[PDB]
Amino acid sequence: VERELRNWLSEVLSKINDAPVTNDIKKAISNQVLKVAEQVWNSKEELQERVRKEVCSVCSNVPACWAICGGLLEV
Amino acid sequence: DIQMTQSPSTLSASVGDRVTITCSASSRVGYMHWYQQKPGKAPKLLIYDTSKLASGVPSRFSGSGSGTEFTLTISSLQPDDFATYYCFQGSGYPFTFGGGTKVEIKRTVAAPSVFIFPPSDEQLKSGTASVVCLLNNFYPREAKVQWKVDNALQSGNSQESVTEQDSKDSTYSLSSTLTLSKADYEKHKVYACEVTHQGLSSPVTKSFNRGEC
Amino acid sequence: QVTLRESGPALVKPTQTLTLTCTFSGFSLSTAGMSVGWIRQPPGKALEWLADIWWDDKKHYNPSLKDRLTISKDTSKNQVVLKVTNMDPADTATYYCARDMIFNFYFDVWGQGTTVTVSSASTKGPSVFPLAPSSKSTSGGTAALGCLVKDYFPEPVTVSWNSGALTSGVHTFPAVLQSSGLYSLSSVVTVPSSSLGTQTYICNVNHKPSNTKVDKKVEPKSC
């Protein structure tokens, strides 16, 4: 399963770099995706909404940021 | 753009004092990192993000701040904290550093050991002669060295060089090299180095004669 | 273990083009989130970020060097190449390549750095001379000795003692600029006088620009 989730990981990171947000937002979302993909090591359709809501919590207040973040995780 | 002023530019403090360097930006910035650079060595990451110690950095180092004002602080200054500290930002291109902050260790006065080196025979084989006067382990770095050849004063023909502060001693070392031709050098006998320093009761003179040894 | 090493010329004549190569190990520029940046430092000046490259071949440059910077990445050889054009004498500096990550957005592991000097003049290897433990002139309860590295260009020389065996009491002075237009530094070391004749001392001088490597035995003067 390591190959599978690592493919997903690299894909979403590449998508993060291309996003129209400051490097701080990229930094936050990237570390969140790292944590989620390495706490797989450590309610079966809603994971796509759990992962999405965990990694994009970094936006918090601003709704704008939630937008681009979720868009990253849809594709 | 995104640019930051550090203050103070330089600072002197005794071992153990709390010292704080302030990096202030020109825009709201997410994080502020800190690098410590020893003389003639690559910068080392000291504080990453805003308050996280990089590997090996002792607990004496703390970092804090937000928005457009950040600080690096050392709780108790150690003699090994002689360095230049640069703040760094990575939240907006282009990456910019702070101007820099040189941290020097204030110390109790110490007098120098004065040694003297006649020119090597290999250098004499090349028509030039260099007499190296060496002042060792003293504080402060301000020290007046003067050359006296056959009791005649010298200018023009010598250069000093001072080391960085000692990482354990917080002292200094200085070398005054006096350079002549083999001709001029062999035209004279006694060569004297007179040092005046804060730590000496009155000036020291180390000297030699040309033929001896 | 992450490790970067810069490589490039020690000398470029003005208006030539500088080609710097960062060679790294411990990570790869193909794995996601990775990056390598170039930061330079002019003598007696602050640090200055020049460029950075990412695993997805994204590139950023400092605007201050507009049009003169071109960075490239070769993941196969684990190398990055900065090319700076129209070299001025104010761009004389030590150039570092460092690693970066999208999680960090700061440089954690730096190379050792490579010094490049922009000048018309030719390289010159240094002369190394023994600063012999003078019989009466460098002794108290301990004795000092050293090496004088004279008349070289450009910076830098590296001076070790006994191939690094002797590290303590070593004072390698910064290079001063003489009237000649060439640099010169001494490297002394304090040892106990009780060990002068018993122990042999050699100093290792290395001038990368002129490809000079010398090892000189500093022995005492017997009068």
Cis ω on the peptide bond leading into residue C209 (within 30° of 0)? no
To the nearest whole angstrom, how far is the Cα of C54 from the nearest Cα of chain A? Answer: 9
Q: Interior CA angle at A31 toward A25 and C99, to 5°?
A: 90
By C-alpha distance, which of C3, C9, C23, C141 is closest to C75?
C23
Contact list in C for residue B90 (CB cut-off 8 A) is 104-106
**How many Cβ atoms from other residues are within 10 Å of residue C28's Cβ?**
11
User: Is B92–A23 a contact, with Cβ atoms under 8 angstroms apart?
Assistant: yes
User: Residues C8, C83: one domain?
Assistant: yes
Give the separation between CA C89 and CA C193, rounded to whole angstroms: 46
Give the separation between CA C11 and CA C190, rounded to whole angstroms: 35
In this structure, the dihedral spanned by the alpha carbons of residues A44, A47, A49 and A50, taken in order and rounded to 10 degrees, is 130
Give the separation between CA C217 and CA B183, rounded to whole angstroms: 27
Q: Give the residue numbers spanning the domain of C148.
A: 127-218
Give the separation between CA B176 and CA B159, rounded to whole angstroms: 5
Cβ contacts from B onto C, under 8 A: 138
DSSP-based helix, strand, coil % in chain A, nearest 5: 75, 0, 25
Cβ–Cβ under 8 Å, residues B147 and B193:
yes
Give the separation between CA A16 and CA C33, rounded to whole angstroms: 9
Secondary structure of residue C197 in the 3-state scheme: coil
Of C118, C152, C168, which one is at a domain's C-terminal end? C118
Q: Give me the number of domains chain C comprises.
A: 2
Which residue is associated with the tokens 């894909």? A11
Cβ contacts from A onto B, under 8 A: 13
Q: Give me the number of domains chain A comprises.
A: 1
* B contact chains, 3+ CB pairs < 8 A: A, C
Q: What is the resolution of this structure in A?
A: 3.2
What distances in angstroms separate CA B79 from CA B103, B166, C56, C139, C159, one per listed residue?
10, 8, 44, 27, 24
Give the side-chain half-sphere CA count within 13 A for B26.
Answer: 8
User: Is A27–B93 a contact, with Cβ atoms under 8 angstroms apart?
Assistant: no
The two tokens of residue B47 are: 């504080």
Q: Which runs of E-coded beta strand occur in B49-190?
A: 52-53, 61-66, 69-74, 83-89, 96-97, 101-105, 113-117, 128-138, 143-149, 152-153, 158-162, 172-181
Q: Give the residue numbers spanning the domain of A65.
A: 2-74
Fold of B113-209: Immunoglobulin-like (2.60.40)
By C-alpha distance, which of C183, C128, C112, C208 is closest to C161?
C128
Cβ–Cβ under 8 Å, residues C1 and C26:
yes
Q: Is A23 in CB contact (< 8 Å) with chain B?
A: yes
Q: How many residues does chain A have?
A: 75
| Minimum-distance CB partner of C33 among A18, A24, A30 | A30
Contact list in C for residue A24 (CB cut-off 8 A) is 105
Give the separation between CA B142 and CA C76, rounded to whole angstroms: 54
Domain-by-domain residue ranges, chain B?
5-105, 113-209
By C-alpha distance, which of B100, B96, B101, B99 is closest to B2?
B96
The two tokens of residue C56 are: 């997805």
Fold of B5-105: Immunoglobulin-like (2.60.40)
For A7, the closest chain C residue by CA position comes to C32
Examine residue C223 and state whether it is found in any structural domain, yes or no: no
The two tokens of residue B1 are: 């753009």
Cβ–Cβ under 8 Å, residues C74 and C88:
no
